PDB file of C-alpha atoms in Angstrom:
ATOM      1  CA  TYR V 200     138.582  59.125 -61.473  1.00  0.00           C
ATOM      2  CA  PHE V 201     138.628  55.340 -61.144  1.00  0.00           C
ATOM      3  CA  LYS V 202     138.346  53.751 -64.573  1.00  0.00           C
ATOM      4  CA  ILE V 203     137.276  50.100 -64.742  1.00  0.00           C
ATOM      5  CA  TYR V 204     137.648  48.564 -68.199  1.00  0.00           C
ATOM      6  CA  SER V 205     136.546  44.976 -68.744  1.00  0.00           C
ATOM      7  CA  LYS V 206     136.163  42.255 -71.354  1.00  0.00           C
ATOM      8  CA  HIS V 207     134.607  38.781 -71.270  1.00  0.00           C
ATOM      9  CA  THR V 208     136.198  36.184 -73.542  1.00  0.00           C
ATOM     10  CA  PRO V 209     135.130  32.566 -74.176  1.00  0.00           C
ATOM     11  CA  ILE V 210     138.249  30.383 -74.061  1.00  0.00           C
ATOM     12  CA  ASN V 211     138.915  26.660 -73.846  1.00  0.00           C
ATOM     13  CA  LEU V 212     142.610  26.618 -72.926  1.00  0.00           C
ATOM     14  CA  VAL V 213     143.543  24.621 -69.847  1.00  0.00           C
ATOM     15  CA  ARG V 214     146.463  26.327 -68.123  1.00  0.00           C
ATOM     16  CA  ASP V 215     148.029  29.543 -69.454  1.00  0.00           C
ATOM     17  CA  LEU V 216     146.831  32.771 -71.067  1.00  0.00           C
ATOM     18  CA  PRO V 217     145.650  32.294 -74.667  1.00  0.00           C
ATOM     19  CA  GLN V 218     147.431  34.207 -77.407  1.00  0.00           C
ATOM     20  CA  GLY V 219     145.175  36.633 -79.233  1.00  0.00           C
ATOM     21  CA  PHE V 220     143.738  40.130 -79.365  1.00  0.00           C
ATOM     22  CA  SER V 221     140.782  41.474 -77.386  1.00  0.00           C
ATOM     23  CA  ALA V 222     140.342  45.187 -76.705  1.00  0.00           C
ATOM     24  CA  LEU V 223     138.800  45.969 -73.329  1.00  0.00           C
ATOM     25  CA  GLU V 224     135.656  48.073 -73.364  1.00  0.00           C
ATOM     26  CA  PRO V 225     135.253  50.818 -70.733  1.00  0.00           C
ATOM     27  CA  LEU V 226     132.749  49.601 -68.165  1.00  0.00           C
ATOM     28  CA  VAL V 227     132.472  52.208 -65.407  1.00  0.00           C
ATOM     29  CA  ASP V 228     134.097  55.454 -64.254  1.00  0.00           C
ATOM     30  CA  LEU V 229     133.905  56.000 -60.519  1.00  0.00           C
ATOM     31  CA  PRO V 230     134.047  59.432 -58.803  1.00  0.00           C
ATOM     32  CA  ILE V 231     136.081  58.227 -55.819  1.00  0.00           C
ATOM     33  CA  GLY V 232     138.645  61.024 -55.272  1.00  0.00           C
ATOM     34  CA  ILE V 233     140.811  58.919 -52.952  1.00  0.00           C
ATOM     35  CA  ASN V 234     144.413  57.760 -52.821  1.00  0.00           C
ATOM     36  CA  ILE V 235     144.973  54.087 -53.717  1.00  0.00           C
ATOM     37  CA  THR V 236     148.402  52.421 -53.579  1.00  0.00           C
ATOM     38  CA  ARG V 237     147.647  48.752 -52.717  1.00  0.00           C
ATOM     39  CA  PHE V 238     145.129  46.126 -53.827  1.00  0.00           C
ATOM     40  CA  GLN V 239     144.041  42.586 -52.969  1.00  0.00           C
ATOM     41  CA  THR V 240     141.959  39.969 -54.790  1.00  0.00           C
ATOM     42  CA  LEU V 241     138.897  38.476 -53.055  1.00  0.00           C
ATOM     43  CA  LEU V 242     138.311  34.733 -53.449  1.00  0.00           C
ATOM     44  CA  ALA V 243     135.636  32.283 -52.311  1.00  0.00           C
ATOM     45  CA  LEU V 244     136.123  29.165 -50.194  1.00  0.00           C
ATOM     46  CA  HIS V 245     134.364  25.848 -50.783  1.00  0.00           C
ATOM     47  CA  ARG V 246     132.973  24.206 -47.646  1.00  0.00           C
ATOM     48  CA  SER V 247     131.750  20.624 -47.293  1.00  0.00           C
TER      49      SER V 247
ATOM     50  CA  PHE X 497     105.803  73.933 -28.142  1.00  0.00           C
ATOM     51  CA  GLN X 498     102.091  74.755 -28.005  1.00  0.00           C
ATOM     52  CA  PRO X 499      99.889  75.540 -31.044  1.00  0.00           C
ATOM     53  CA  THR X 500      98.609  78.785 -29.463  1.00  0.00           C
ATOM     54  CA  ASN X 501     102.070  80.333 -29.061  1.00  0.00           C
ATOM     55  CA  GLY X 502     103.260  83.423 -30.881  1.00  0.00           C
ATOM     56  CA  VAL X 503     105.247  83.294 -34.106  1.00  0.00           C
ATOM     57  CA  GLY X 504     108.460  84.026 -32.201  1.00  0.00           C
ATOM     58  CA  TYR X 505     107.905  80.945 -30.033  1.00  0.00           C
ATOM     59  CA  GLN X 506     106.430  78.568 -32.616  1.00  0.00           C
ATOM     60  CA  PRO X 507     108.675  75.666 -33.695  1.00  0.00           C
ATOM     61  CA  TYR X 508     110.673  76.214 -36.873  1.00  0.00           C
ATOM     62  CA  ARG X 509     112.369  73.413 -38.773  1.00  0.00           C
ATOM     63  CA  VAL X 510     115.775  74.578 -40.016  1.00  0.00           C
ATOM     64  CA  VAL X 511     117.846  72.867 -42.715  1.00  0.00           C
ATOM     65  CA  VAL X 512     121.276  74.386 -43.373  1.00  0.00           C
ATOM     66  CA  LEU X 513     123.020  73.380 -46.589  1.00  0.00           C
ATOM     67  CA  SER X 514     126.810  73.692 -46.549  1.00  0.00           C
ATOM     68  CA  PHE X 515     128.603  73.753 -49.906  1.00  0.00           C
ATOM     69  CA  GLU X 516     132.327  73.005 -49.978  1.00  0.00           C
ATOM     70  CA  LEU X 517     134.749  72.386 -52.828  1.00  0.00           C
ATOM     71  CA  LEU X 518     137.570  69.897 -52.255  1.00  0.00           C
ATOM     72  CA  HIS X 519     140.256  68.606 -54.638  1.00  0.00           C
ATOM     73  CA  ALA X 520     138.196  65.421 -55.154  1.00  0.00           C
ATOM     74  CA  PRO X 521     135.950  65.322 -58.272  1.00  0.00           C
ATOM     75  CA  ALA X 522     132.808  67.366 -57.680  1.00  0.00           C
ATOM     76  CA  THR X 523     129.765  65.122 -58.074  1.00  0.00           C
ATOM     77  CA  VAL X 524     126.816  67.095 -56.621  1.00  0.00           C
ATOM     78  CA  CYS X 525     126.028  69.125 -59.722  1.00  0.00           C
ATOM     79  CA  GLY X 526     123.044  71.222 -60.712  1.00  0.00           C
ATOM     80  CA  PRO X 527     120.443  70.128 -63.258  1.00  0.00           C
ATOM     81  CA  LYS X 528     121.637  69.617 -66.819  1.00  0.00           C
ATOM     82  CA  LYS X 529     118.924  71.496 -68.686  1.00  0.00           C
ATOM     83  CA  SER X 530     118.016  70.217 -72.140  1.00  0.00           C
ATOM     84  CA  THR X 531     116.124  71.517 -75.159  1.00  0.00           C
ATOM     85  CA  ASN X 532     114.338  69.732 -77.995  1.00  0.00           C
ATOM     86  CA  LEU X 533     116.527  68.337 -80.762  1.00  0.00           C
ATOM     87  CA  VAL X 534     116.437  70.139 -84.122  1.00  0.00           C
ATOM     88  CA  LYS X 535     117.906  68.426 -87.182  1.00  0.00           C
ATOM     89  CA  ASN X 536     119.013  69.498 -90.684  1.00  0.00           C
ATOM     90  CA  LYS X 537     119.947  73.055 -89.642  1.00  0.00           C
ATOM     91  CA  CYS X 538     123.214  74.804 -88.811  1.00  0.00           C
ATOM     92  CA  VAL X 539     122.897  75.058 -85.019  1.00  0.00           C
ATOM     93  CA  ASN X 540     125.265  75.362 -82.068  1.00  0.00           C
ATOM     94  CA  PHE X 541     125.279  71.946 -80.406  1.00  0.00           C
ATOM     95  CA  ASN X 542     126.328  71.179 -76.824  1.00  0.00           C
ATOM     96  CA  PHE X 543     126.313  67.397 -76.307  1.00  0.00           C
ATOM     97  CA  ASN X 544     127.612  66.266 -72.874  1.00  0.00           C
ATOM     98  CA  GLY X 545     130.050  69.162 -72.665  1.00  0.00           C
TER      99      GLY X 545
END
């Protein structure tokens, strides 16, 4: 089972993580049944 | 395949369903049958397992 928990928080701090409490709600459970040992973030470029 | 052929020569569409169980979580499940909800009585409830 792949559990994805998530939380959206409105912050106004410029640089670091804000200090506070926010419990993450469960968003989606995925029936994947596969081995996962590595991950990578996906970003977006800006072209002009 | 001609329409006037015998039943042993007429075309037959065949679909074979193969059921396997693997160590991955089983997700093709049969219908979850439900019955009407009855309130205010001592009943045996089965809610989502």
